[PDB]
Symmetry: C3
Subunit: 316 residues, 3 copies
């Protein structure tokens, strides 16, 4: 089917951690960018308007661009950049399946590294794996890093001379992340993305993960892991069988990454919270204002197209 979407690029500010507001270039004014969810074989048309003061593009990472290389989104290679105030239309066929993503390809070190110019592109295969047919909850986790020194400073950051001192999943640092709420018997598909410039060692307490896909494509030899290393550009899909009721923390195991501006705890941390587990008064998230779509789990159930999320929207 033909899938036509309109995206904008906006100058907005988001809250990454307590005390850290960050100026970003948000697709549809949000970080992560909108979820794009389509079927294998769909013809995609994206009309992009640049409402920022700088040039950008959108590269569709994982999309082959078979006979459509001029929609690959690389400035000086496949197109001239999209200048401030201008528009550009991308057209491609979604013939590559799985967990893909999209991001700006101008000034990548800054724009993708610290300005949040990325989002998920999920292409449903015609032939999912047997285990994928058992999935009851689909979870998107996009990891990135932030340099507090350039929080207020478009045009700076993302160099070896900068210090990445905050770390996140879906643009939040713990405790501003959200729990992953499950029920006993759930079969959870988690899609990890190396969105930023860091490496993340994602570890699930209480469960092993079956690693089923690398960069969206199914492995002939899937393998179990309790810690999955995710590096820039990569995606890994795993399955967790939710067969062990408790509260089980789930986080980046890189020691310096569980900090926020030099203090602990912070970073890419969530908790696998099973329904019906009694809540102790000392539980860190006992009074959580819950967002059920923090990992796009609700949007992933609502059909094919483009999905904004109010929780990811920044302020103008």
């Amino acid at each position: 089917a033909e899938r036509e979407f309109d995206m904008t690029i906006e100058e907005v500010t988001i809250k990454v951690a307590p005390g850290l507001d960050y100026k970003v270039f948000g697709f549809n004014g949000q970080v992560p960018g909108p979820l794009i969810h389509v079927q294998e074989g769909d013809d995609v048309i994206v009309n992009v308007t640049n409402n920022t003061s700088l040039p950008h593009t959108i590269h569709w990472h994982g999309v082959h661009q078979k006979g459509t290389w001029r929609s690959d989104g690389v400035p000086g290679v496949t197109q001239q950049p999209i200048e401030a105030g201008d528009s550009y239309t991308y057209k491609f066929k979604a013939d590559r399946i799985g967990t893909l993503w999209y991001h700006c390809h101008v000034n990548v070190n800054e724009h993708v590294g610290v300005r949040g110019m990325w989002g998920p592109l999920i292409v449903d295969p015609k032939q999912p794996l047997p285990i994928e047919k058992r999935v009851t909850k689909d979870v998107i986790m996009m990891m990135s890093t932030w340099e507090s020194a350039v929080a207020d400073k478009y045009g700076e950051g993302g160099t070896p001379m900068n210090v990445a001192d905050y770390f996140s999943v879906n643009a939040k640092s713990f405790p501003l992340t959200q729990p992953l709420r499950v029920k006993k018997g759930d079969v959870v598909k988690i899609r990890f993305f190396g969105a930023g410039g860091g490496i993340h060692a994602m570890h699930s307490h209480g469960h092993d993960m079956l690693v089923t896909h690398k960069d969206g494509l199914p492995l002939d030899s899937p393998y179990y892991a309790d810690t999955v290393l995710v590096s820039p550009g990569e995606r890994y899909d795993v399955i967790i069988e939710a067969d062990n009721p408790g509260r089980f923390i789930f986080h980046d195991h890189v020691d310096t990454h569980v900090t926020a501006g030099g203090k602990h705890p912070g970073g890419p941390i969530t908790v696998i919270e099973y329904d019906g587990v009694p809540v102790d008064d000392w539980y860190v998230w006992k009074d959580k204002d819950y967002d059920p779509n923090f990992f796009y789990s609700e949007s992933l159930k609502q059909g094919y197209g483009m999905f904004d999320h109010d929780g990811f929207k920044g302020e103008f």
Copy 2:
């Protein structure tokens, strides 16, 4: 079988490198912590006493805690911390097989990153791989990094603003590491752990490694490597066939990691020394003061239980 162990957490100082003494929180006053070696299906009880000035927990990394999540050892999630001077008992069934480990889960960036709060937990499968039944030597290598600026200062370190300038296997930096001594025909199982906050590219000269397990679980498709990348939290088990007599260096291939305080050589370096090879006068480790249990290989032959090692023990104040 029910296996009950008593462990303490102690404030001690260890020698990581020549000219680098480091204040740590050592399980039983040592880094690495004691080897815990049990069988699949055992019921494990660990009574922990905190003899330090700061709160800690023990998380059992790889242990599912099937129906025992309150023993997972995570502060503010599964328990309140073990305060200074207090005790706490962990109970869990070892139903997850393989190379596991344990570490503190309080102030992790510092306690695990630079205070040596970790040790190995080996769970023997009831049905090991055929290749594991050929093994004649079992070897534990726990890699970590150290920040010299906070060596003498509990309560600091483990942040992006600190500089990790020393590197180790089993808490020692070359030349204070020990050789891996083998003889022709040995079948060596090596278990790599990303214990600290660094990434380590472990390269064996003279041999390929058959990578057989990831995080303790056997791969359906094992593969050969001469360099295995080990990142925080991960474990890899490999097999080396010791069929090539020589002196073969075995080290972290990350260029900056073969230094110590800006000087070279240093870092996670050992040598696979074959017994039959005549020793040259210029060999760096000629007349080495040898510790046969530096990789826990002797402890791993002594049956199920918990094993301290004096080679790893630190000095009390």
Copy 3:
């Protein structure tokens, strides 16, 4: 067969980037060092003469040194160093197949980290994979990093206290790299090397990579990837089916690595350029002064031996 080669170590200066010349110890006065290409079972002899002011060795990474451990090239372990002005002969049997490499093993943090003391060693199996039979182009990509503060001064660099601020493939930083020119129907073997001290996430636009070998040895279970993480010491061989005509960028996806001295663009970046695709006026590499052997692809067709390349030579 017995194959005997003569190599020197020279003090030369290479151009790594615009704004970065670098003092290096080049094998045969070039970085990367000469391609050594032999067949499984060959008896290799390399006579090395040290024409520099400092001691060196050559370690043959991946070579087992079966019955020849004294040729392993490790100072204080298998030999005393090759002192300034002296010579030394290595002899070994190439019984280990695949993508290997060689590098100095004296003061490795500096000499391999920033002085370019490395090159490729390719051992052809007597029995190649079926997949390798279809290969029409062979490509070598050796990634490394550079510290500008020590560009002029042998005896410093390669420590945690230094800043790596330039990044390269085959010792050039974009735009001084070269395109990978292919024709539709090509089957391209790419051999990635972690030659320096960095981690590199190599991402091919427009194509998936079939990962066929790890450290030169064939995987029982090959897998597709669009991003391949290459760390120090490692090699990965991949196959790309050149079935998608366009201009497709091919680069390190680690955000900070696509910079040069704090500026973007730079780093390990090439472009898969298909023959016959019209060149746009704004294409960054329009009228490029092209080197068809920048990835050793021409040398790799010339049989067994040691092959220098003028494009890699430094100046005295």
